[PDB]
């Protein structure tokens, strides 16, 4: 017979708006959380529970049939199940339903610190090399000097880069009561490494005050290069300010706490002749991200040393970078035949 005449006509639109995506929006649009790095079970070749192809999150595979095959045919639309929780609807919903991964540690988005100009480092004011040192877990950066002094008593300034030895030494000289102080205490000494420091710094930022300060610095500088740098940072600051008028667009959303997962029909997994399978690289990249996140969560569960956590967090950042922009990496992820994987930006 003829196709069912879907009366849901597409909603006409005249504009497209783009902006940074908040974690709240990613969670609100998502149907679930991908918890396993599996795609299909190797013994049954069926989508795995809570995996990248999960029928609980992304939709049924068969038309008007659930996973356990108890509810069938059009009579049972909208009934998910009592047993396998898989909605009885059209399989085409596997092209529109998305998922997410809740990262245990925030990971910076590669774009906003690799596609020049360096957006995060222009907002914070740090040069790109130091920002990379922050991101790849090599130095601590102080967000609030507090009452902490230097090793010889020198005043500690905001945005100071301290190694592990320096951080431990400074934490030693701190009073015992200061470590337990609330984050709103002006005297608390806060130093962070990785993407959490960037989150805190970009949250504490004030765009209007920063723009006025940069205009003042450009108007009262005797160096042409310093003026050029000031105006270049002013460009990005004013771009963010203009973005904040149309929608809500915050700098902290450049550091991602949730990783969205695209519908499985756009990252297929097909069976070929000879009994082999062929998968999209996006499945592999999501697998790497999930594996790193799960390993980091387990390591924190057992109170691992502070070098294993650092290595795992840096590896997780690298995995997310490979997922988004593989070519921009210094050492792009490659197959055994030395062919770089294809990411979302590729």
């Amino acid at each position: 017979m003829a196709r069912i005449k879907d009366n849901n006509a597409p909603k006409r639109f005249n504009k497209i708006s783009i902006g940074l995506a908040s974690p709240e929006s990613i969670l609100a649009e998502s149907r679930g959380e991908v918890l396993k790095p599996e795609t299909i079970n190797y013994r049954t070749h069926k989508p795995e529970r809570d995996g990248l192809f999960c029928e609980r999150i992304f939709g049924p595979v068969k038309d008007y049939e659930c996973a356990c095959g108890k509810y069938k045919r059009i009579r049972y639309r909208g009934i998910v199940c009592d047993r396998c929780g898989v909605e009885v609807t059209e399989k085409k919903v596997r092209r529109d339903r998305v998922g997410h991964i809740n990262l245990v540690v925030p990971v910076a988005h590669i774009w906003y610190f690799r596609s020049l100009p360096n957006k995060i480092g222009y907002l914070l004011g740090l040069p790109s090399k130091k920002l990379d040192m922050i991101i790849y877990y090599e130095r601590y950066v102080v967000i609030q000097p507090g009452i902490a002094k230097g090793p010889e008593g020198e005043e500690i300034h905001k945005l100071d880069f301290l190694t592990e030895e320096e951080y431990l030494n400074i934490l030693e000289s701190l009073p015992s009561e200061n470590q337990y102080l609330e984050e709103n205490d002006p005297n608390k000494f806060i130093a962070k490494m990785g993407a959490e420091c960037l989150i805190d710094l970009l949250a504490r930022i004030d765009l209007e005050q920063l723009s006025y300060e940069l205009r003042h610095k450009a108007n009262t500088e005797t160096s042409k290069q310093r003026k050029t740098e000031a105006l270049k940072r002013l460009q990005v600051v004013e771009a963010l300010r203009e973005s904040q008028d149309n929608r809500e667009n915050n700098p902290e959303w450049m550091i991602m706490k949730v990783i969205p997962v695209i519908p499985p029909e756009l990252r297929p997994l097909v069976p070929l002749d000879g009994g082999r399978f062929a998968t999209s690289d996006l499945n592999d990249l999501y697998r790497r991200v999930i594996i790193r996140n799960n390993r980091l969560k387990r390591l924190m569960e057992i109170k691992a040393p502070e070098v294993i956590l650092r290595n795992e967090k840096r590896m997780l950042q690298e995995a997310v970078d490979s997922l988004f922009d593989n070519t921009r990496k210094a050492s792009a992820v490659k197959t055994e035949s030395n062919r770089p994987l294809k990411s979302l930006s590729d």
Partner: protein
């Protein structure tokens, strides 16, 4: 007093692990690359080797022993992946990027198959509706037998206790 890294590990000081890591990381990476070809899995196994050295730090006796431990453990981890069905299955899967312009001539479907499947579903539904319409014409006991058998499902035992007839009688009536 500048103790050697062996006694730092024995004491329970975490910076010791930083020392052994910074010293033997590349050697263990080479050891892993000798046995496997996946850098991701090799890095995972290196992290596991160092963490398990830290966990078994109460079993070392010599400064060189530490190194030996690392190497030993890391090797066996690689070896275990020769047996894991998950790893074999995931390494038996190619990448669609290996076929140039795979989106043009591969991963295809025909809507005729979907329409035929829906038509078959409609045929089955019509047959079941015919059966449901026939049901009221039957004797009341045999109608309730079928109705129960369609909402619990050919459960001769639980139906027999529900009814009063035995397993044999209930099966015969069904």
């Amino acid at each position: 007093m500048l103790y050697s890294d062996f006694e730092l590990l024995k004491i329970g000081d975490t910076s010791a692990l930083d020392h052994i890591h910074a010293k033997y990381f590349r050697s263990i990476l080479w050891i892993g690359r000798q046995w496997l070809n996946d850098d991701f899995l090799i890095e995972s196994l290196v992290q596991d080797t160092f963490l398990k050295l830290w966990v078994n730090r109460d079993k070392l006796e010599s400064p060189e022993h530490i190194f030996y431990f690392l190497r030993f453990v890391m090797k066996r981890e690689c070896i275990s992946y020769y047996r894991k069905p998950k790893y074999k299955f995931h390494k038996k899967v190619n990448s669609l990027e290996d076929y140039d312009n795979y989106q043009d001539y591969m991963v295809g479907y025909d809507p005729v198959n979907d329409s035929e499947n829906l038509d078959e579903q409609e045929s089955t539904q019509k047959s079941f509706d015919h059966i449901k319409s026939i049901l009221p014409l039957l004797n009341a006991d045999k109608r309730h037998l079928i109705e129960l058998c369609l909402k619990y499902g050919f459960q001769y035992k639980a139906i027999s206790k529900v009814m009063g007839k035995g397993i044999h009688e209930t099966s015969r009536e069904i």
